[PDB]
Amino acid sequence: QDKSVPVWNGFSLYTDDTVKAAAQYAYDNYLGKPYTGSVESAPANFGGRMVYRQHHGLSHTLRTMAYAELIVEEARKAKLRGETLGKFKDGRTIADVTPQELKKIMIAQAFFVAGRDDEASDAKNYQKYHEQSRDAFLKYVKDNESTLLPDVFKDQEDVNFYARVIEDKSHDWESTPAHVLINQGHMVDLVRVKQPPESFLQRYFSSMQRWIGSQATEAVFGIQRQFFHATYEVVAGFDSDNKEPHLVVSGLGRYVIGEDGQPIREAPKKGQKEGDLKVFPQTYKLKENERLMRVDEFLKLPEIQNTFPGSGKHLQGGMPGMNEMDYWNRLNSLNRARCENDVDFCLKQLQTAHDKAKIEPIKQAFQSSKGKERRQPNVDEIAAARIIQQILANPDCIHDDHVLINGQKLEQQFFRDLLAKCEMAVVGSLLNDTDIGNIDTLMRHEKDTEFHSTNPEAVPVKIGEYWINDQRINNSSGNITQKKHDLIFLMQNDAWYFSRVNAIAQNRDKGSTFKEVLITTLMTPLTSKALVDTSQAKPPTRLFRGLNLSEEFTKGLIDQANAMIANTTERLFTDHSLNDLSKMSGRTNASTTTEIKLVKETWDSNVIFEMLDPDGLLHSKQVSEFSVYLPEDVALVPVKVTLDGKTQKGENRYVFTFVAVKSPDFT
Ligand SMILES: [Hg+2]
Ligand SMILES: [Hg+2]
Ligand SMILES: [Hg+2]
Ligand SMILES: [Hg+2]
Ligand SMILES: [Hg+2]
Ligand SMILES: [Hg+2]
Ligand SMILES: [Hg+2]
Ligand SMILES: [Hg+2]
Ligand SMILES: [Hg+2]
Ligand SMILES: [Hg+2]
Structure with a gap:
């Protein structure tokens, strides 16, 4: 062969x-x-x-x-x-x-x-x-x-x-x-x-x-x-237990079970232990003690079971x-x-x-490492998130020295308690974008509420006005990702705000008003949420690396790529269970770019490694150009090889496409 x-x-x-x-x-x-x-x-x-x-x-x-x-x-x-x-x-x-x-x-x-x-x-x-x-x-x-x-x-x-x-x-x-x-x-x-x-x-x-x-x-x-x-x-x-009549597809016929309870067969040719299954038309009249072979009976026949992987299966x-x-x-x-x-x-x-x-079967072939585990929010934190969302949405509940919301009067100490005892990053993960949008709601209502720096001589600032004007001018479309950015900006840059917030959040403030305590309690989890939802920096999904290889060596690598690609197939009924390539694709390196034109027109590389990183497993860093690190437990598995024209001199140009995959089994 x-x-x-x-x-x-x-x-x-x-x-x-x-x-x-x-x-x-x-x-x-x-x-x-x-x-x-x-x-x-x-x-x-x-x-x-x-x-x-x-x-x-x-x-x-x-x-x-x-x-x-x-x-x-x-x-x-x-x-x-x-x-x-x-x-x-x-x-x-x-x-x-x-x-x-x-x-x-x-x-x-x-x-x-x-x-x-x-x-x-x-x-x-x-x-x-x-x-x-x-x-x-x-x-x-x-x-x-x-x-x-x-x-x-x-x-x-x-x-x-x-x-x-x-x-x-x-x-x-x-x-x-x-x-x-x-x-x-x-x-x-x-x-x-x-x-x-x-x-x-x-x-x-x-x-x-x-x-x-x-x-x-x-x-x-x-x-x-x-x-x-x-x-x-x-x-x-697909049910192998299906009870309805089997249909004999070519000829749209049937098999009939006789009185014995066995399928009717043509006389056996020689070197046949059993005769061919006799195919009847749908107009054939059934005798008494005769009935049609069911689908489940059919699939259980040794001749089908010997030869069709779907016998005994269910999809x-x-x-x-x-x-x-x-x-x-x-x-x-x-x-x-x-x-x-x-x-x-x-x-x-x-x-x-x-x-x-092409990628999914390559993933099922290895135990994926167990992602991190996470405690559930406790009942207090869920309740903290509720009450923040309600206040944000119903700011008329906010009064000088308290909030009045569900028959209760929430005073200063209550909000300090939330800060001392609930974990605000967790509280913040229960909050949603409509809540981020209601920052406007809150800030409108609180337009002339004075927010005081920890600097005694500083001028008090009107935080609501500050917030609201800034949003009309610079985020007039009400864009919510942008509100997240602006909220982080306010936390990072404006000391009149962050000083009081951090002082209260640490319980070492002095001369804080009720509103300052409240606002600190509201914004802190929202800001947490903002950091988290905007710091999901995604590695590029598709990178190209250029190489310059003898065509002989290249053919080597083709045979190995073909050999990994050929062994990974999507299954339907059945299951699954270091090369020159794995070393070569895997070594950390700098002739990488997201721009295919760079690799072809400019560098004229005759061998290109296309790296797919749908799951962002590749630690990369920009030096257009780029340098790539492979985590120990991440491997580049071949998915495809092809001829992609020629170089400017006229040599065959090959592209090897790999996908980045994470597994314990690698290290
Ligand atoms: Hg089934
Ligand atoms: Hg047809
Ligand atoms: Hg139809
Ligand atoms: Hg079954
Ligand atoms: Hg009001
Ligand atoms: Hg209220
Ligand atoms: Hg009120
Ligand atoms: Hg709490
Ligand atoms: Hg002041
Ligand atoms: Hg930002």
């Missing part, structure tokens, strides 16, 4: 302009148009906007194209792990598809159902609609020969073949990657809707598995679920961590209609989901 795979050239559905434009034309000219036929063709309304083709529309189409990218990706990975994939007649496998091929396929995919006039499913209409699809495709190419011509499709003959795949006449069927990726991506999109779902899933699975193997096939179906979430469509449950439907009511609303949202009518938006959703799906 040869586990070689050629290096990808950067091609993707999400970033190629030709493909995008092909989908856009498919939308504008076909998929976004009302159906003109009568079969099950009513437009559907999602959050108030119409989706004219909710089954075979834009989102469906784009999903089929994302599936092609995902299938080829998981096939390549399977070949790299050393598995033996199904072969076409020419000896190729799906792991051998090139970017130039996949791009022709995606463009063809864009028009695969453009030709449908409604949802009629009989064969005379299938054929007409696929002829109409073919014409659409061929019109597209004619109108764009110039750019598509030599550059995407070799010649008309090449164009004519993809046109034939779309037309899908049986006498044109071949085992080719185009034929198979197109039919497969198309049919797997039905998992979202068809019932019983266990029946359809096992069929579609077993049909993919023969091309790409079982572990890849789990990845493709696992990720598909995320694509459905991303495009605001239903994610189906909850919908979305992990949402209500039914929210989930239902999410499916019925404007976001569904946007996906269905806006190419850019829908591609972006799938993109984001596809990128996340």
